[PDB]
mmCIF file of N, CA and C and ligand atoms in Angstrom:
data_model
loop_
_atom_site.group_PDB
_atom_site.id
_atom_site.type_symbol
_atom_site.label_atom_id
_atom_site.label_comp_id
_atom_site.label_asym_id
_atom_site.label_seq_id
_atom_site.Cartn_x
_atom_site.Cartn_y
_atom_site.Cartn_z
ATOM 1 N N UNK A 1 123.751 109.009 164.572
ATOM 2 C CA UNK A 1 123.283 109.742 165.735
ATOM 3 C C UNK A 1 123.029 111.205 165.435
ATOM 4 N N UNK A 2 122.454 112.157 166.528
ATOM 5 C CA UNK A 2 121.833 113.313 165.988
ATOM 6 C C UNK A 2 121.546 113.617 167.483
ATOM 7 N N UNK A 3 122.437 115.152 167.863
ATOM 8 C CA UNK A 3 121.791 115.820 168.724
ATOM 9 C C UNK A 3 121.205 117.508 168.229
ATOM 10 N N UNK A 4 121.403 117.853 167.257
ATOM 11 C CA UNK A 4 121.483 118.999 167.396
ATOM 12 C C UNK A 4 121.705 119.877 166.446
ATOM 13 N N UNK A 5 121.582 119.498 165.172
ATOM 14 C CA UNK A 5 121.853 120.226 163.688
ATOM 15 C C UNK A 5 121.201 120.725 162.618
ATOM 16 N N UNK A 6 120.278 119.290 162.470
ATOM 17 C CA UNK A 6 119.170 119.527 161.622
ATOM 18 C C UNK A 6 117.869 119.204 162.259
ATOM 19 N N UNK A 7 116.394 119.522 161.008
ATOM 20 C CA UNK A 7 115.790 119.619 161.475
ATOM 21 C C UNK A 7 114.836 118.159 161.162
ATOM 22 N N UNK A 8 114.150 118.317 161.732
ATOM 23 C CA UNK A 8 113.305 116.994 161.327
ATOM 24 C C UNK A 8 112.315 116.391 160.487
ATOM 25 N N UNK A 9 112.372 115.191 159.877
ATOM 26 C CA UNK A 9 111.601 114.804 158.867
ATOM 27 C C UNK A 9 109.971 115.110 158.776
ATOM 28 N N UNK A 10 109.313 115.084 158.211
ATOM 29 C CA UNK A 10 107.763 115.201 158.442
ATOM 30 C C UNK A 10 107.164 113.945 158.212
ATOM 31 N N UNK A 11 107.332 113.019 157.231
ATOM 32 C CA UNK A 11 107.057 111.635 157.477
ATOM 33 C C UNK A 11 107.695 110.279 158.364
ATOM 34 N N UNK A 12 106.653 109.997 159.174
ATOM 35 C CA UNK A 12 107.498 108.885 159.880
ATOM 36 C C UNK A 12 107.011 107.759 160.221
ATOM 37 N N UNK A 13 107.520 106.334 159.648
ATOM 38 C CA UNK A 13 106.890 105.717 159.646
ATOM 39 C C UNK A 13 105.859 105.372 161.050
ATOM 40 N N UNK A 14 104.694 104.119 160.725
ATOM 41 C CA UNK A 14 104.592 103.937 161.589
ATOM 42 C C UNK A 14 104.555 102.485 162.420
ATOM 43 N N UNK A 15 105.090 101.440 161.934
ATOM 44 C CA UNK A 15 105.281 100.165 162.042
ATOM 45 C C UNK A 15 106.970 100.357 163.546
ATOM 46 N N UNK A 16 108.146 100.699 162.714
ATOM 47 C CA UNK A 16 108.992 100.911 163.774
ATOM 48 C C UNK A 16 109.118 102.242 163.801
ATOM 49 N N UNK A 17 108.801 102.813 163.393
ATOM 50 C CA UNK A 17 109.054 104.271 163.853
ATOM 51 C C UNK A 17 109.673 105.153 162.968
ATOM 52 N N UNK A 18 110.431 104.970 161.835
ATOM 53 C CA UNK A 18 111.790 105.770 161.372
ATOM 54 C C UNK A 18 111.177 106.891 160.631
ATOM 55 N N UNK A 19 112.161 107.629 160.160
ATOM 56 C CA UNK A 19 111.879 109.216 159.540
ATOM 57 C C UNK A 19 111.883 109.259 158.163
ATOM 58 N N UNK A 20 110.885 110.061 157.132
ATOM 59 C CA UNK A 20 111.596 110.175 156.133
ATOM 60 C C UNK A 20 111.534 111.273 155.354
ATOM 61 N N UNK A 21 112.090 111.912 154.460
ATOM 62 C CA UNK A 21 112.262 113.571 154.071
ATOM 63 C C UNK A 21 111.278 113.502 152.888
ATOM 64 N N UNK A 22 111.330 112.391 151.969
ATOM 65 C CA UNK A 22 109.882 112.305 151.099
ATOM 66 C C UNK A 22 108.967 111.733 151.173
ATOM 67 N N UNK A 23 107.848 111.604 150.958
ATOM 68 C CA UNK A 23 106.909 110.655 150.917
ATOM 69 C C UNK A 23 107.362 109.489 150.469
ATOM 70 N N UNK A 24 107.455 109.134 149.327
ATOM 71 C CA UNK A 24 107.613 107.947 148.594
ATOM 72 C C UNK A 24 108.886 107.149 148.809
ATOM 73 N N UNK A 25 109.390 107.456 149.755
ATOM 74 C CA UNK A 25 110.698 107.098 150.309
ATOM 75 C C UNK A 25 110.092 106.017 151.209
ATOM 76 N N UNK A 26 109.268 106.680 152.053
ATOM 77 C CA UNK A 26 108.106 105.488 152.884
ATOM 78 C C UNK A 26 107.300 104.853 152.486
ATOM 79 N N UNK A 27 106.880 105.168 151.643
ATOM 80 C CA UNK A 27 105.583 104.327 150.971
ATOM 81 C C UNK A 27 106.653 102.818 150.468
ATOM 82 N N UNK A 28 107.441 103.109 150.050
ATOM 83 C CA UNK A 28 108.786 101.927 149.558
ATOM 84 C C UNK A 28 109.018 101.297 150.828
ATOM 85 N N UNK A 29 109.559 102.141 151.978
ATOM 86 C CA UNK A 29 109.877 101.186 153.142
ATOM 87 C C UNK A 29 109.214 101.057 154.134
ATOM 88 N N UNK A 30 107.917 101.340 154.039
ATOM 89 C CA UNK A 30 106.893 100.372 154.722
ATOM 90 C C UNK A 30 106.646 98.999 153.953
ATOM 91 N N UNK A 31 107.488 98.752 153.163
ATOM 92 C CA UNK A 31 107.489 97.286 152.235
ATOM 93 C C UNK A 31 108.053 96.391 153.053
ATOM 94 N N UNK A 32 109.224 96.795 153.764
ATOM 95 C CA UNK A 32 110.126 96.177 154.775
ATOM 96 C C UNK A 32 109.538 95.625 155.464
ATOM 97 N N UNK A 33 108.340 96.056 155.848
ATOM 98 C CA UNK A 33 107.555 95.483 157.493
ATOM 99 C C UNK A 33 107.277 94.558 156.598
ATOM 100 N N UNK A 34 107.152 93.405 155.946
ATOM 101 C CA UNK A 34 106.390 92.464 155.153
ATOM 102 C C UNK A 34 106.986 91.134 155.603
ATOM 103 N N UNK A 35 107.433 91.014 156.406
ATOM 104 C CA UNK A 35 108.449 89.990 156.635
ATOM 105 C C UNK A 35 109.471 90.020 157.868
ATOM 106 N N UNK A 36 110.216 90.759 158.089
ATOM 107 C CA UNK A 36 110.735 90.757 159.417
ATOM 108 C C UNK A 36 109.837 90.443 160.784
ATOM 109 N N UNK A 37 109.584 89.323 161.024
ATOM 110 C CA UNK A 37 109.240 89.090 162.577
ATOM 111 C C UNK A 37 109.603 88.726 163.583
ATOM 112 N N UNK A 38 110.351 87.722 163.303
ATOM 113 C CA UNK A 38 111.796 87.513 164.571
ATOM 114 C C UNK A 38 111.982 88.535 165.087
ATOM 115 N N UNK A 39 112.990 88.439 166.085
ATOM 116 C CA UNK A 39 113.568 89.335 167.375
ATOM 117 C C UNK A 39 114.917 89.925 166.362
ATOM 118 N N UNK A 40 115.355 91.028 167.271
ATOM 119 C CA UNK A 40 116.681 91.165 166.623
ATOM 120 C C UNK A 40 117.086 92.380 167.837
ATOM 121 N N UNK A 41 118.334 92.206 167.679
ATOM 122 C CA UNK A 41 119.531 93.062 168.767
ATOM 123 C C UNK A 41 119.624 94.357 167.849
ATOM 124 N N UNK A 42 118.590 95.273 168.145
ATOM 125 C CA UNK A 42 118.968 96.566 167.526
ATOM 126 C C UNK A 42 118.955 96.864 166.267
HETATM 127 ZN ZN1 ZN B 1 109.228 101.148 159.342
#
């Protein structure tokens, strides 16, 4: 969680949304979306 400390990433994905501080950090986990399609609790 995070209210109030730091500052924010400049890359973010765009499949679910998440943040990331390097590029190539995302370019790797936009790999993830390749397969997860089911539902899931959070
Ligand atoms: Zn993602």
């Amino acid at each position: 969680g995070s209210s109030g400390s730091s500052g924010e990433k400049p890359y973010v994905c765009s499949d679910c949304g998440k943040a990331f501080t390097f590029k190539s950090q995302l370019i790797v986990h936009q790999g993830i979306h390749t397969g997860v399609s089911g539902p899931s609790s959070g």
